[PDB]
Design a protein around this nucleic acid. Structure first.
Ligand SMILES: Nc1ncnc2c1ncn2[C@@H]1O[C@H](COP(=O)(O)OC(=O)[C@@H](N)CC(=O)O)[C@@H](O)[C@H]1O
Length: 585
RNA sequence: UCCGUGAUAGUUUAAUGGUCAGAAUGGGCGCUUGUCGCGUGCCAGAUCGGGGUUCAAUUCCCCGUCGCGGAGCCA
């Protein structure tokens, strides 16, 4: 019933009589003249009202912000003097000839003139979406899923939906349950991912699978984690890790080219180890020129426990972080970080201010130089390539803390000091993650998941040297975000049992929770491997946010709630009756 | 579960142990023929819950509630 979208009107439409549908973005009543900025998904147009069209001018008097209206008029140009060089429809305006108010809007819970609170934006998400900046991100999402499916189809992947009311799939997180009314006492599990099912689809013979799916993990949030998120899930048969990475890297290289006009180039490949080593993170943000430099060897003989303990401990590490120009840091700045590294378990944070390297010791300033010496200090500077003006922090504890603390620090200092080049893109693959990690209760846990194949290893070899075992798994990271992760699957019942075993899953359980899989591995399973992207995160990077909820139409709070609909909600007593369940007192 | 931070008109948010709780935007009624952050005049517009301290609490303390960030947890 509309004949054009407000935002699409241009000088070319001059003369066109049009019927616009939308909302009032702004009302300017100059008494005899009313200027209404009409808006719809495409933009804003200025409709003009004047004394000729009496009733219209009068009715227009009633208009308020966000009123839902319809207007029919004619597109005329504006005199040079009235042109708005800051609006797409700027050279034009539509002279109203008729105005109809479909609906009025009560006062808005969100003032359209200023950065509203998150809590408010969420509670009234639908009004918040009306903002171009926000609506735009959802359009770019759509452009992404369109580009994705077309790319995947052209590469012969079949888009297959998997079950939501299903069995428990181990992705690491906690499972959301769903009690059965008909089968009382038993529940379903919302999928943490279609993992087990896509593997079965490979065993079924579909050769290449993919799906844009909703995944559910009952864990706590973060700016890049929602308990319900969307993955671009993919799986293949008869393909190696390299081949999988190749086509996955091509999808992404393709997304950036079509959405940002940027050619990401060939992705660098780095091992889990090289990563933790140079950046103490398996999601290295390569836009940051800084990196950890180890210096334990240099400090084994030093009579300073803080350094000597970790330097002479196999489990310990001593990493120096050279922050360019960081000598300027204030004593309170050096303290905020000192506290910051504590968040990750670091006891302290020693430093060395490099003022004049040529002047030797009298050229530097550090509360620990009395424990080091002219030569040790020079080695450390030479190593880190530290020069006049720079600072050098140190992290000394067990490998893990040094990595976590100094890893975090490296990012923080980088952003604070404006060292991190946010002008570019840093894609890369991180490969060879270990197969297992210390679970903390004496056992082990699967890094990626229990259906991940070891890089070159026999069920017998794994069952013997598990802790060491390198998984044939890979992660794609961009600008510090782990936007995708995958692995070559275990297509061998023998292997699958050895793994369940190492992960301490007894037979009874192997049968209760993974029986269908252990049996399916008996019918000629092909070699298979896959990977899943975090669609949300991929959109964040492509729409320029750092907030995952900014790319999800209806996000949840860090407390897993939906303010706009106030959910979850207390259930009806009889509802729970038919569910054979009761809340615990 | 924990740490950090915030809680004041519709909204964003200033201040404050005793008083005039300030502004912008927004709302109501005027005036106003080229505005586009319209301008302008009058009117109305608020201190999260419980407890505590205190002569007195929006303000101080504790607890609880909720948003955000982070830890744990979770790729
Ligand atoms: N809570 C979350 N909120 C938002 N995004 C999330 C969340 N959790 C994960 N992601 C994103 O999804 C990618 C794939 O998930 P994975 O856990 O790596 O593995 C899986 O789901 C395997 N089945 C994939 C495979 O083996 O093929 C992650 O890289 C990440 O960007």
């Amino acid at each position: 019933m509309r004949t054009e979208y407000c935002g699409q009107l241009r000088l070319s439409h001059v003369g066109q009589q049009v019927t616009l549908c939308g909302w009032v973005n702004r009302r300017r009543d100059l008494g005899s003249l009313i200027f209404i900025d009409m808006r719809d998904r495409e933009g804003i147009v200025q409709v003009f009202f004047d004394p000729d069209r009496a009733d219209a001018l009068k009715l227009a008097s009633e208009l308020r912000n966000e009123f839902c209206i319809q207007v029919t008029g004619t597109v005329r140009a504006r005199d040079e003097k009235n042109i708005n060089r800051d609006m797409a429809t700027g050279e034009i305006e539509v002279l109203a000839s008729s105005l109809t108010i479909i609906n009025r809007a009560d006062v808005l819970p969100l003032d359209s003139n200023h950065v509203n609170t998150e809590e408010a934006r969420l509670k009234y998400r639908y009004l918040d979406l009306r903002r171009p900046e926000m609506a735009q991100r959802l359009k770019t999402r759509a452009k992404i899923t369109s580009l994705v499916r077309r790319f995947m189809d052209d590469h012969g992947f079949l888009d297959i939906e998997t079950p939501m009311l299903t069995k428990a799939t181990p992705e690491g997180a906690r499972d959301y349950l769903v009690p059965s009314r008909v089968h009382k006492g038993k529940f379903y599990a919302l999928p943490q991912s279609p993992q087990l099912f896509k593997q079965l689809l490979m065993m079924s013979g579909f050769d290449r699978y993919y799906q844009i799916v909703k995944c559910f993990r009952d864990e706590d949030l973060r700016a890049d984690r929602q308990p319900e998120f969307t993955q671009i899930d993919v799986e293949t048969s008869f393909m190696t890790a390299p081949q999988v990475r190749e086509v996955m890297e091509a999808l992404v290289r393709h997304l950036w080219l079509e959405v940002k006009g940027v050619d990401l180039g060939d992705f660098p490949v780095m091992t889990f180890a090289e990563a933790e080593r140079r950046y103490g993170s398996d999601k290295p943000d390569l836009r940051n020129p800084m990196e950890l430099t180890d210096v334990a060897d240099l400090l084994k003989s030093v009579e300073f426990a803080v350094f000597a303990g970790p330097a002479n401990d196999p489990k310990g590490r001593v990493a120096a972080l050279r922050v360019p120009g960081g000598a300027s840091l204030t004593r309170k700045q050096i303290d905020e970080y000192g506290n910051f590294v504590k968040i990750y378990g670091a006891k302290g944070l020693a430093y060395i201010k490099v003022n004049e390297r040529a002047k030797g010791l009298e050229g530097i300033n550090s509360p620990v130089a009395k424990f080091l010496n002219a030569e040790i200090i020079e080695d450390i500077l030479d190593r880190t390539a530290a020069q006049d003006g720079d600072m050098i922090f140190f992290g000394a504890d067990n490998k893990k803390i040094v990595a976590d603390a100094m890893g975090a620090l490296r990012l923080k200092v980088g952003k604070d000091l404006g060292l991190t080049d946010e002008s570019k893109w840093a894609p890369l693959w991180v490969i060879d993650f270990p197969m297992f990690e210390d679970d903390g209760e004496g056992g082990l846990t699967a890094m990626h998941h229990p259906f991940t194949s070891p890089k070159d290893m026999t069920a017998a070899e794994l069952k013997a040297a598990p802790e060491n075992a390198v998984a044939n798994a890979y992660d794609m990271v961009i600008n510090g975000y782990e936007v995708g992760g995958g692995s070559v699957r275990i297509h061998n019942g023998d292997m699958q049992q050895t793994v369940f075993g190492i992960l301490g899953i007894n037979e009874e359980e192997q049968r209760e929770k993974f029986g269908f899989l252990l049996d399916a591995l008996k019918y000629g399973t092909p070699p298979h491997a896959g990977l899943a992207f975090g669609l949300d995160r991929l959109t964040m990077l492509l729409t320029g946010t750092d907030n995952i909820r900014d790319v999800i139409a209806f996000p949840k709070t860090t407390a897993a709630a939906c303010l706009m609909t106030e959910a979850p909600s207390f259930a009806n007593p009889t509802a729970l009756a038919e569910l054979s369940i009761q809340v615990v007192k």
